[PDB]
Amino acid sequence: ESADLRALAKHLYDSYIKSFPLTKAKARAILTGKTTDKSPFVIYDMNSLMMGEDKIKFKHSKEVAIRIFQGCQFRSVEAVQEITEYAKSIPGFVNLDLNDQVTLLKYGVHEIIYTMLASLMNKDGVLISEGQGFMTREFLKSLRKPFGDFMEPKFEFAVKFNALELDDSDLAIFIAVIILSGDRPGLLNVKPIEDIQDNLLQALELQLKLNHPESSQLFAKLLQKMTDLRQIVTEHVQLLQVIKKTEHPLLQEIYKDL
Amino acid sequence: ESADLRALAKHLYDSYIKSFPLTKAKARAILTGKTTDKSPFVIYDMNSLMMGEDKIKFKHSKEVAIRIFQGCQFRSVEAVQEITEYAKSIPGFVNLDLNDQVTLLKYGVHEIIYTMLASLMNKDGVLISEGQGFMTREFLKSLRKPFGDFMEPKFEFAVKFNALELDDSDLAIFIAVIILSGDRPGLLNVKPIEDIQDNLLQALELQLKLNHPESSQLFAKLLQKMTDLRQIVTEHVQLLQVIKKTETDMSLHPLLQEIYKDL
Ligand SMILES: *c1ccc([N+](=O)[O-])cc1C(=O)Nc1ccncc1
Ligand SMILES: *c1ccc([N+](=O)[O-])cc1C(=O)Nc1ccncc1
Ligand SMILES: CCCCCCCCC(=O)O
Ligand SMILES: CCCCCCCCC(=O)O
């Protein structure tokens, strides 16, 4: 019944607005200069970076590309918590085996992070720190190996992902689909997981149809992007290993892999 | 609104289950004799100790007292890792300044060790190796000179703390109150810490009165235990500085060494 699919779609959208501060509707305004009420500090090279810690406050000898990467880790840890709280609002998620919940979040966050990073990106850079900042794609490239290689694949993916012109109400259901993948390693009771993903998949299909009637087979194209996602993540984890032989103790524990 | 504080209580209980594999409910099922859990092998002398590595999974002629000490030292490392994971689930914690996160963990972690260790203790001893073993208080107090006195203050606190009859969902909120202190030496921005803790304190208070309605002033009686916790740490680090000079061949784990900072 489409009423329950539209009900589910509104629920997830509300829960996604509450859980993720900087939404795509918001970030799209800041990036296009439409909402001139406040313009982010742009970081385009070293001196703009050094200046950037003065305007935008952060927490942090200690080379530039390392400090940027560390701040990227800091932000990752925050996004995990926002994702965890979003997941808890997906109908049926909390009722799952606690270990399956943990396994679903553990393998699902890198996918969701790069998905949602695309909301903050265009071909020329990425909003940082709630969008008070904008780090140019070209400045991120100008970092030494392996660090200049780090964000370029994500920019690459976002440019194509954003060409789908999804909005927050679309993404809210997409993100739920990603979390409820029954093929994560080590799951103990795949059935209720896949039962929820089928229900979320129906909701996503009805949503893309009404929200994008002119976008033929958008549902399928969005599902195909989850290929680019998994390949992104696979390439991302190995880079992190290369880094773990380029670069404390309590910090090491806060930034355990994931 | 109570509903908001109940939701926070459920959130923290949920994350506590996910971060701490040996809960108090499990540990009491093992200690009291329930059939949901199985029987510990009991170490009370060197013979039973020697049988323990056979029967119980350990990881370890580097004399008995030192061997126990390195084993209990490696378990502390694992507990620190577990506490660090639970902390990141405390809402607002990861949004704090990174320096204050490290500082909250550095001081909060040992007070949490001995709070939760109380869950593994009764009058007579303490579970070990994820509840597969049980090391008697007497065998611990009988260890040589310096080492014989490491655990007895923990047993003394645990016996009084356990008298409160807190359960895991109480402990989850209480451990979060501990982490978000704000009176820790060196904190850069005390106010966002104190705002979180006040929410935790509100959460703990509603939880204690719903979960233990007959237990008058349990909230206040639980906050006063934070003093016994402070005292247990200080005795510990001073006893640690003795071993550092006695056995200058004994090594401390780096995670644990950085947590310990003179003055
Ligand atoms: C930066 C550095 C390391 C990792 N990681 O090892 O998972 C991830 C990131 C990253 O891109 N974090 C991020 C999350 C959300 N928004 C922006 C950046
Ligand atoms: C024993 C010896 C040294 C230290 N330390 O420097 O923190 C800790 C311990 C100890 O009691 N570890 C422990 C933690 C949690 N559960 C059981 C034992
Ligand atoms: C210094 C802020 C870092 C936030 C992470 C957003 C992506 C850009 C980066 O790699 O730093
Ligand atoms: C060999 C592991 C030791 C378990 C650590 C628990 C603390 C109490 C003790 O060690 O006796």
Author numbering:
A (entry chain B): 207 to 266, 274 to 460, 466 to 476
B (entry chain A): 207 to 266, 274 to 476
Please, what does the article write about this entry?
The distinct pharmacological phenotypes of PPARγ ligands are dictated by ligand-dependent recruitment of transcriptional coregulator proteins (coactivators and corepressors) to the PPARγ ligand-binding domain (LBD). The LBD contains the orthosteric ligand-binding pocket, which is the binding site for endogenous and most synthetic ligands, as well as the activation function-2 (AF-2) coregulator binding surface.
GW9662 and T0070907 contain the same 2-chloro-5-nitro-N-phenylbenzamide scaffold but differ by a simple atom change: a ring carbon in the GW9662 phenyl group is replaced by a nitrogen-containing pyridyl group in T0070907. Crystal structures of PPARγ bound to T0070907 or GW9662 reveal no major overall structural differences that explain the difference in efficacy. Strong electron density was observed for T0070907 in chain B and lower, less defined electron density in chain A. In both structures, PPARγ crystallized in the same space group and contained a dimer in the asymmetric unit with the expected α-helical sandwich fold. Chain A adopts an active conformation with helix 12 docked into the AF-2 surface; however, helix 12 in chain B is distorted due to crystal contacts and docks into the AF-2 surface of a neighboring symmetry related chain A molecule, thus influencing the conformation of helix 12 in both chains. Furthermore, the guanidinyl side chain of R288 forms a bipartite hydrogen bond with the side chain of E295. In contrast, the hydrogen bond network in the GW9662-bound structure is not extensive due the lack of a hydrogen bond acceptor in the phenyl ring of GW9662. In contrast, T0070907 did not decrease transcription for the R288A or R288L mutants, indicating the R288-mediated pyridyl-water network is responsible for the transcriptional repression conferred by T0070907. Our crystal structure of T0070907-bound PPARγ revealed a water-mediated hydrogen bond network linking the critical corepressor-selective inverse agonist switch residue (R288) to the pyridyl group of T0070907.
